Scaffold this active site. Structure first.
Site, PDB file in Angstrom:
ATOM      1  N   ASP A   1      -8.723 -10.091  10.107  1.00  0.00           N
ATOM      2  CA  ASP A   1      -8.293  -8.743   9.668  1.00  0.00           C
ATOM      3  C   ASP A   1      -9.337  -7.646   9.716  1.00  0.00           C
ATOM      4  OD1 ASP A   1      -5.934  -7.133   8.444  1.00  0.00           O
ATOM      5  OD2 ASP A   1      -7.475  -6.955   6.807  1.00  0.00           O
TER       6      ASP A   1
ATOM      7  N   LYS B   1      -9.315  -3.294   1.916  1.00  0.00           N
ATOM      8  CA  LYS B   1      -9.142  -2.096   2.697  1.00  0.00           C
ATOM      9  C   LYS B   1     -10.023  -0.939   2.191  1.00  0.00           C
ATOM     10  CE  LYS B   1      -5.901  -3.989   5.263  1.00  0.00           C
ATOM     11  NZ  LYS B   1      -6.164  -4.283   6.678  1.00  0.00           N
TER      12      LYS B   1
ATOM     13  N   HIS C   1     -10.574  -2.653  11.828  1.00  0.00           N
ATOM     14  CA  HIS C   1      -9.362  -3.478  11.523  1.00  0.00           C
ATOM     15  C   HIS C   1      -9.132  -4.418  12.640  1.00  0.00           C
ATOM     16  CE1 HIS C   1      -4.816  -3.301  10.255  1.00  0.00           C
ATOM     17  NE2 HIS C   1      -5.426  -4.311   9.684  1.00  0.00           N
TER      18      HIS C   1
ATOM     19  N   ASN D   1       6.917  -7.585   3.485  1.00  0.00           N
ATOM     20  CA  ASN D   1       5.421  -7.534   3.393  1.00  0.00           C
ATOM     21  C   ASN D   1       4.853  -8.532   2.399  1.00  0.00           C
ATOM     22  OD1 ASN D   1       2.737  -6.367   4.012  1.00  0.00           O
ATOM     23  ND2 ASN D   1       2.804  -5.488   1.899  1.00  0.00           N
ATOM     24  N   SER D   2       5.627  -9.581   2.063  1.00  0.00           N
ATOM     25  CA  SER D   2       5.106 -10.632   1.219  1.00  0.00           C
ATOM     26  C   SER D   2       3.946 -11.369   1.901  1.00  0.00           C
ATOM     27  CB  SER D   2       6.236 -11.615   0.793  1.00  0.00           C
ATOM     28  OG  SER D   2       6.879 -12.134   1.966  1.00  0.00           O
ATOM     29  N   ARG D   3       3.080 -11.931   1.066  1.00  0.00           N
ATOM     30  CA  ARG D   3       1.782 -12.456   1.554  1.00  0.00           C
ATOM     31  C   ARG D   3       1.432 -13.807   0.981  1.00  0.00           C
ATOM     32  NH1 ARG D   3      -1.147  -8.858   5.424  1.00  0.00           N
ATOM     33  NH2 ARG D   3       0.093  -6.965   5.311  1.00  0.00           N
TER      34      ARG D   3
ATOM     35  N   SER E   1      -1.265  -3.194  11.718  1.00  0.00           N
ATOM     36  CA  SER E   1      -0.489  -4.082  10.849  1.00  0.00           C
ATOM     37  C   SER E   1       0.875  -4.373  11.504  1.00  0.00           C
ATOM     38  CB  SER E   1      -0.338  -3.502   9.441  1.00  0.00           C
ATOM     39  OG  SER E   1      -1.565  -2.971   8.981  1.00  0.00           O
TER      40      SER E   1
ATOM     41  N   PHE F   1       2.723 -15.769  21.464  1.00  0.00           N
ATOM     42  CA  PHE F   1       2.102 -16.764  20.594  1.00  0.00           C
ATOM     43  C   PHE F   1       1.091 -17.633  21.366  1.00  0.00           C
ATOM     44  CE2 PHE F   1       6.235 -15.329  19.025  1.00  0.00           C
ATOM     45  CZ  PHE F   1       5.810 -14.699  17.851  1.00  0.00           C
ATOM     46  N   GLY F   2       1.208 -18.954  21.284  1.00  0.00           N
ATOM     47  CA  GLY F   2       0.237 -19.837  21.965  1.00  0.00           C
ATOM     48  C   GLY F   2       0.141 -19.587  23.476  1.00  0.00           C
TER      49      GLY F   2
ATOM     50  N   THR G   1      -3.013 -11.858  12.921  1.00  0.00           N
ATOM     51  CA  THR G   1      -3.242 -13.174  12.325  1.00  0.00           C
ATOM     52  C   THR G   1      -2.784 -14.312  13.242  1.00  0.00           C
ATOM     53  OG1 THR G   1      -3.403 -12.278  10.115  1.00  0.00           O
ATOM     54  CG2 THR G   1      -2.800 -14.685  10.330  1.00  0.00           C
TER      55      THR G   1
ATOM     56  N   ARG H   1       0.845  -1.197   0.000  1.00  0.00           N
ATOM     57  CA  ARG H   1       0.000   0.000   0.000  1.00  0.00           C
ATOM     58  C   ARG H   1       0.881   1.246   0.000  1.00  0.00           C
ATOM     59  NH1 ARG H   1      -1.815   0.878   4.411  1.00  0.00           N
ATOM     60  NH2 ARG H   1      -1.403  -0.945   5.721  1.00  0.00           N
TER      61      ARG H   1
ATOM     62  N   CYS I   1       1.545  -6.317  13.972  1.00  0.00           N
ATOM     63  CA  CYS I   1       1.500  -6.472  15.423  1.00  0.00           C
ATOM     64  C   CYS I   1       0.772  -7.732  15.884  1.00  0.00           C
ATOM     65  CB  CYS I   1       0.882  -5.227  16.090  1.00  0.00           C
ATOM     66  SG  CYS I   1       1.956  -3.770  15.894  1.00  0.00           S
ATOM     67  N   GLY I   2       0.510  -8.624  14.943  1.00  0.00           N
ATOM     68  CA  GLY I   2       0.060  -9.993  15.286  1.00  0.00           C
ATOM     69  C   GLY I   2      -1.393 -10.373  15.327  1.00  0.00           C
TER      70      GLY I   2
ATOM     71  N   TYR J   1      -0.986  -4.492  -6.648  1.00  0.00           N
ATOM     72  CA  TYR J   1      -0.690  -5.135  -5.413  1.00  0.00           C
ATOM     73  C   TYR J   1      -1.819  -5.046  -4.368  1.00  0.00           C
ATOM     74  CZ  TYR J   1       2.138  -7.045  -1.760  1.00  0.00           C
ATOM     75  OH  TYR J   1       2.622  -7.847  -0.752  1.00  0.00           O
ATOM     76  N   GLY J   2      -2.097  -6.188  -3.749  1.00  0.00           N
ATOM     77  CA  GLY J   2      -2.789  -6.294  -2.502  1.00  0.00           C
ATOM     78  C   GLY J   2      -3.853  -5.271  -2.164  1.00  0.00           C
ATOM     79  N   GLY J   3      -3.610  -4.515  -1.116  1.00  0.00           N
ATOM     80  CA  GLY J   3      -4.583  -3.538  -0.677  1.00  0.00           C
ATOM     81  C   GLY J   3      -4.841  -2.416  -1.677  1.00  0.00           C
TER      82      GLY J   3
END
Ligand SMILES: Nc1nc2c(ncn2[C@@H]2O[C@H](COP(=O)(O)OP(=O)(O)OP(=O)(O)O)[C@@H](O)[C@H]2O)c(=O)[nH]1
Ligand SMILES: O=C([O-])C(=O)[O-]
Ligand SMILES: [Mn+2]
Ligand SMILES: [Mn+2]
Ligand code: NA
Ligand code: NA
Length: 608
Positions: free
Chosen positions: A306, A239, A259, A398-400, A281, A516-517, A286, A82, A283-284, A230-232
């Protein structure tokens, strides 16, 4: 007419089949953009497989032979994210779009006048699709036919966009049938590279970086995007529609477009609650949305990772839907340790963008934490041979991946329920290396909106209120007022609001929390608090867990004093920094209740 009937150029579907207003939108933009062909997408498997195989034959994408129907796109490195400075919202008055900052530059959006946009549009779109196919993508944001769903039509000259929209939205003929003669968001996209090419093509990736412009015209219900594939910037539902356009719609109509991940959490007793969380974005979201909880007997299921659309129902429950149909997730950092459920989801039917490829046809990225057999080599996302000691990463940061939601092994059973899921807690969180404890609970709805307004990203430096800094569809002051207004909705069941911080560091820069977990232990505490459990201690910043309230079994090396500490000195600075920011960036549009919460916090800290 005496001589714009584009029927002769339709290579899939029929213009006569389309609702009248859809046809007008297609044909007006066909006259404008001059595509060679028009392809009305049906969303079928056949269409999708044909489109992929076509892209493969042109060198636009590569098949990843190690996996089941997975694909790799490597972009022109000028088109990888973006572009916030080329992302704009058009309104009659600037102040309706962004507050007027005292420092002459807003961090909270970017306005463009109608006049300037008209000029920009005329300088880009005329003839921009010459020699290409215009694909017509009918899509639903949200479960098809849901009262909370909204339909769009995206016109694009990019097969990559068509494939990715098929994953990330519900698209095809069933959407056209559902739409009938109803309203839809008008989405127009072009890579901005009419044939014959005026400039050389880089990495078989059409884009026009110099003329890139992602525009939103909320008053006209239009999104118009040029130059980026690209993406967004190109998948308009995500978005552009589901945050920027939808947040303004939400403000007018009494709901919220945010968001936020949405998850369902089940305790060992079988009791289930849904939570929504806004982290900026990087900051976790997903990782949390897909968490594999370490605590025995707990379960986390993913509704979305998201975007959340949330609206109070007749009984006053805040109902959320995920308007997306897939996960467009950051690939680097994704590992069996950080997101085992994503590792599972992405091994079939997934499109990867800008990641590395292994010599056996697999994927690779920084933080994949998975060694390769001796002899297996790596091609970087820049299509060069690569070794782990090289200065550059193997994958773009920032690959997806772009993966179907329905494949996630922990997808929530209600992830497509049309009335949505009842949210009982809202979690805010960001990257705070210093000062902010692992978890706290807001004192009230108004305190909680202030806490969202105080969120930070990028090492505790950048303010990213509500994780929406790049996404506000309208003036942030007014968005605060809108959130505050929810307290006055009769019989509203207001969610409990929490703030988390996975990112506190000691003096050496080491994380104090394993994350994480292990975050399951924090969710357990929030769950008990929603249930009314006496597990909270009051502090100047809000409620925190009592001593011994958190389950820390299996984590005896945690520095509890430092992780949960509250320093008067730190909090004095924080309130001063928040004051300066809200004054600089929001000023005249700051709601009195936000000002009052800032004073209340200052006052509680003064008594330490
Ligand atoms: N230390 C720590 N880092 C985490 C945790 N969860 C996520 N991360 C970090 O978060 C980053 C990945 O988050 P992203 O997928 O970029 O975040 P997102 O919120 O999904 O972003 P968008 O998809 O761009 O909205 C990586 O740097 C992870 O290491 C955690 O519990 N602890
Ligand atoms: O693509 C995203 O999810 C983002 O940038 O927040
Ligand atoms: Mn994500
Ligand atoms: Mn996001
Ligand atoms: Na390419
Ligand atoms: Na109020």
């Amino acid at each position: 007419q005496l001589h714009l009937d584009f029927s002769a150029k339709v290579i899939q579907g029929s213009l006569d089949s389309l609702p009248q207003e859809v046809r007008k939108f297609v044909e007006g933009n066909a006259q404008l953009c001059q595509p060679e062909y028009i392809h009305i997408c049906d969303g079928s498997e056949e269409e999708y497989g044909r489109l992929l195989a076509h892209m493969q034959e042109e060198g636009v994408i590569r098949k990843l032979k190690k996996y089941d129907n997975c694909w790799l796109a490597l972009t022109d490195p000028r088109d990888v994210a973006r572009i916030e400075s080329k992302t704009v919202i058009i309104t009659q008055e600037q102040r309706d779009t962004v507050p007027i900052p005292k420092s002459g530059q807003s961090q909270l959006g970017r306005w463009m006048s109608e006049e300037d946009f008209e000029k920009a549009f005329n300088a880009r779109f005329p003839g921009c699709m010459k020699g290409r196919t215009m694909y017509v993508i009918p899509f639903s944001m949200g479960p098809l036919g849901s009262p909370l769903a909204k339909i769009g039509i995206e016109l694009t000259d990019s097969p990559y966009v068509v494939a990715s929209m098929r994953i990330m939205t519900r698209m095809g003929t069933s959407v056209l049938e559902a739409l009938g003669d109803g309203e839809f968001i008008k989405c127009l996209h072009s890579v901005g590279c009419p044939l014959p090419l005026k400039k050389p093509l880089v990495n078989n990736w059409a884009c026009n970086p110099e003329l890139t412009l992602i525009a939103h015209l909320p008053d006209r219900r239009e999104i118009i995007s040029f130059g980026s594939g690209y993406g967004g910037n190109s998948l308009l539902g995500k978005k552009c529609f589901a945050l920027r356009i939808a947040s303004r719609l939400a403000k007018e109509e009494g709901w919220l477009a945010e968001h936020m991940l949405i998850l369902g959490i089940t305790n060992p007793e079988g009791k289930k609650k849904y939570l929504a969380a806004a982290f900026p974005s990087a900051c976790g979201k997903t990782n949390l949305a897909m968490m594999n909880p370490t605590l025995p007997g707990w379960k986390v299921e993913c509704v979305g990772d998201d975007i959340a659309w949330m609206k109070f129902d007749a009984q006053g429950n805040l109902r959320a839907i995920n308007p997306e149909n897939g996960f467009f997730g950051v690939a680097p950092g994704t590992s069996v340790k950080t997101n085992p459920n994503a590792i599972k989801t992405i091994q079939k039917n997934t499109i990867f963008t800008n990641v590395a490829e292994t010599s056996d046809g697999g994927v690779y990225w920084e933080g994949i934490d998975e060694p390769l057999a001796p002899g297996v080599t790596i091609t970087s996302w820049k299509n060069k041979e690569w070794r782990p000691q090289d200065e550059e990463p193997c994958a773009h940061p920032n690959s997806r991946f772009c993966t179907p939601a329905s494949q996630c092994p922990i997808i929530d059973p209600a992830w497509e329920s049309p009335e949505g899921v009842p949210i009982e807690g809202i979690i805010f969180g960001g990257r705070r290396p210093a000062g902010v404890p692992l978890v706290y609970e807001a004192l009230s709805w108004q305190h909680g909106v202030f806490v969202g307004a105080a969120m930070r990203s990028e090492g505790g430096i950048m303010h990213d209120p509500f994780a929406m800094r790049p996404f506000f569809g309208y003036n942030f002051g007014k968005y605060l007022a809108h959130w505050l207004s929810m307290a006055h909705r009769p019989a509203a069941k207001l969610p409990k609001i929490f703030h988390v911080n996975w990112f506190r560091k000691d003096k050496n820069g080491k994380f104090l929390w394993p994350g994480f977990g292990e975050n399951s232990r924090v969710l357990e505490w929030m769950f008990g608090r929603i249930e009314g459990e006496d597990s909270a201690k009051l502090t100047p910043i809000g409620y925190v867990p009592k001593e011994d309230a958190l389950n820390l079994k299996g984590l005896g090396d945690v520095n509890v004093e430092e992780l949960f500490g509250i320093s008067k000195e730190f909090w004095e600075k924080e309130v001063e920094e928040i004051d300066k920011y809200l004054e600089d960036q929001v000023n005249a549009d700051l709601p009195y209740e936000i000002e009052r919460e800032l004073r209340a916090l200052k006052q509680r800290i003064s008594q330490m």
